[PDB]
Amino acid sequence: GPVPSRARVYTDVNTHRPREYWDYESHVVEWGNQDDYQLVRKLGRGKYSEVFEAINITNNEKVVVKILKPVKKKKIKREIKILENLRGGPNIITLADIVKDPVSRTPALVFEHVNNTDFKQLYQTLTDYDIRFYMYEILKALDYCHSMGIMHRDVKPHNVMIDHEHRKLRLIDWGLAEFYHPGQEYNVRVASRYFKGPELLVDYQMYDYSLDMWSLGCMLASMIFRKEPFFHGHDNYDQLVRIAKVLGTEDLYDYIDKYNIELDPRFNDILGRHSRKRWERFVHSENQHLVSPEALDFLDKLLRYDHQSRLTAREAMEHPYFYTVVKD
Ligand SMILES: COc1cc(/C=C/C(C)=O)ccc1O
C-alpha cells in the first residue's frame, strides 16, 4: 500500500487540544437574531453558498452575510467550528454572528465587512513591493491556522480578499477547511483545479497543511510571472501534466515512488518525459520588475512535488524575499 505521511510541524496540535476543539460534530451553535441583519445586495453565488452585502441595524454597520446552501450538517458545523476556533487570528475573516435564515432554512454566517478589489484587476497593478507585502500577510493567516491545527484546502486568489486602499487582507471561505490529525486520510477532491497539489492529483490522501503551501506557490507564480493561472490544466489529469512539464517527470516519479504511489494508467499516453525547467524561462520584459533571485528561490521552495519538502508557513516568513517588506 501507500507509505504513511505526517506533517513536519504542528503535528499533534489537535491531539493535545481538548476534544471539544476539533470534534465539530458535537458543536452546539449559538444563534443570534436574524432580524439584526438586512440584506442589501447579492455579491455572489458559489456551489455551497450565496453571499450578500448587508447592514447590521443594531449599529448601522456593513457586514457580509453568507447563506449556506443545504449540505451535510457536518460540513456546516465544520466550517462554523473552524471559524470560531480561528476568530481573532491574523488576517482570518472574522465570524461576527450566526443566524437561521427563514427562507433558505439554513445557517447564515455573518462576517466583518471586507471592501474588495477584484483580484483579476488587482493583480494587473500590483507592484513588486505589493506582492511581497500581501504574500507575507497571507503567510500570517496560514501559519496561524496551521498552528491551530487547521488546513484551509482552498487557497486561491478568489479566497484572498484584499482592501488595497487600507492594505488589508482577509483569508475567506473556510468551507473546505479541515482539522489535521496525524495519519488521517482526507478527501482529495478539494481546492480549485489550478491550485490542487500533486498529492491530490495522484490521489494521495494522507496530506496535511503543506497542501496550502503548494496552492500559495501557484498564486505566487501567477503574480510574479503575470500568468493567471500559472498551471492551466483542462482537467485534473492535464493539470498534473502541466505541472510535470515544469517540475519534470523524473522528480514526479521520485515523489510517487517515495510514497509507493501508483499513477493512474491513463497517464501512460499523456504524461511523456520532461526535464525540470529553470524558473528564468518564465521571465520576460513584461514581468521582470516583479522577479528577483529571492522571488525565484522562494517560489522554487514552495512548488515541490513532495509535500514534505515544501517550506512551512513559518519558514516561508523567514525567507529573504520578505526582507524588504516593512515589519509592523
Ligand atoms: C464565500 O465565502 C466567504 C465569502 C466572504 C466575502 C465575500 C465578499 C465580501 O465578496 C467572506 C467569508 C466567506 O467564508
Cell numbers placing 204: 494521495
Q: What's the CA-to-centroid distance between 66 and ligand 1, angstroms?
A: 7
- Residue 28 to residues 24, 85, 98, 297: CA-CA distances in angstroms? 9, 14, 12, 46
Active site residues: 154
List CB contacts of 41: < 8 A, sequence separation 6 or more.
52, 53
The residue among 133, 123, 142 whose CA lies nearest residue 302 is 142
Say whether 3 counts as a known binding-site residue. no
- Give the β-pairing of 178-179 and 150-151: antiparallel
The residue type of 149 is G
Cell numbers placing 72: 451535510
Answer yes or no: is the C-beta of 116 below 6 A from any ligand 1 atom: yes
Q: Is 227 left (phi over 0), alpha (psi -120 to 50) or beta?
A: beta
List CB contacts of 269: < 8 A, sequence separation 6 or more.
none
Cell numbers placing 279: 524558473
Q: Please return the burial class of 48, using the count of CB atoms within 10 Å of its CB with bins 0-12, 13-18 and 19+.
A: middle
The residue among 328, 281, 274 whose CA lies nearest residue 305 is 274
CA neighbours within 13 Å on the CB side: how many for 98?
Answer: 15
- CATH number of the 23-113 domain: 3.30.200.20
Contact present, 150 and 314 (Cβ < 8 Å): no
Which sign, positive or negative, has the C-alpha torsion 201, 293, 124, 169?
A: positive
Method: X-ray
8-state DSSP, 293: H
Q: How far apart are CA 32 and CA 99, in angstroms?
A: 5
Q: How far apart are CA 225 and CA 284, in angstroms?
A: 8
Instruction: Quote the longest CA-to-CA distance of the chain.
Output: 62
Resolution in A: 1.8
Q: How far apart are CA 73 and CA 82, in angstroms?
A: 14
- Residue 125 to residues 130, 177, 202, 224, 287: CA-CA distances in angstroms? 9, 30, 35, 11, 11
Q: What's the CA-to-centroid distance between 148 and ligand 1, angstroms?
A: 21
Q: How far apart are CA 316 and CA 322, in angstroms?
A: 9
List CB contacts of 315: < 8 A, sequence separation 6 or more.
none
Strand-pair partners of 37 = 56
CA neighbours within 13 Å on the CB side: how many for 77?
Answer: 13
Return the residue matching grid coordinates 444563534: 31
Cell numbers placing 33: 437574531
Which sign, positive or negative, has the C-alpha torsion 261, 267, 269, 275?
A: negative
Using DSSP's 3-state secondary structure scheme, residue 74 falls into helix
Answer yes or no: is the C-beta of 108 below 6 A from any ligand 1 atom: no
Strand-pair partners of 95 = 111
Say whether 44 counts as a known binding-site residue. yes
In a mutational test of the pocket of ligand 1, which residue from 49, 50, 51 has the highest number of ligand atoms less than 8 Å from its CB? Answer: 51
In a mutational test of the pocket of ligand 1, which residue from 113, 116, 152, 173 has the highest number of ligand atoms less than 8 Å from its CB? Answer: 173
Q: Please return the burial class of 145, using the count of CB atoms within 10 Å of its CB with bins 0-12, 13-18 and 19+.
A: buried
Answer yes or no: is the C-beta of 66 below 6 A from any ligand 1 atom: yes
Answer yes or no: is the C-beta of 178 below 6 A from any ligand 1 atom: no
Contact present, 47 and 66 (Cβ < 8 Å): no
Alpha helices in the chain (DSSP H): 13-16, 19-22, 73-86, 119-125, 128-147, 198-201, 210-225, 236-247, 249-258, 293-302, 313-317
- Give the β-pairing of 107-112 and 168-171: unpaired
8-state DSSP, 3: P
51-73: buried (b, 16+ CB within 10 Å) or exposed (e) per residue?
bbebbbeeeeeebbbbbbeeeee
Give the closest residue (by CA) to ligand 1 atom 13: 173
Using DSSP's 3-state secondary structure scheme, residue 25 falls into helix
Return the residue matching grid coordinates 450566526: 98
Q: Report chain breaks in the chain, C–N > 2.5 Å, as residues after which they occur.
A: none
Structural domain spans, the chain: 5-22+114-328, 23-113
Q: How far apart are CA 150 and CA 124, in angstroms?
A: 31
Answer yes or no: is the C-beta of 95 below 6 A from any ligand 1 atom: no
Q: What's the CA-to-centroid distance between 114 and ligand 1, angstroms?
A: 8
User: ∠ at Cα 247 (244, 252), nearest 5°?
Assistant: 60
What is the architecture, at CATH level 2, of domain 5-22+114-328? Orthogonal Bundle (1.10)
DSSP string, 295-314: HHHHHHHH--SSGGGSPPHH
Q: What's the CA-to-centroid distance between 263 and ligand 1, angstroms?
A: 36
Q: How far apart are CA 290 and CA 132, in angstroms?
A: 10
Instruction: Specify the ligand 1 atom closest to the Cα of 175.
Output: 14
Q: What's the CA-to-centroid distance between 21 and ligand 1, angstroms?
A: 24
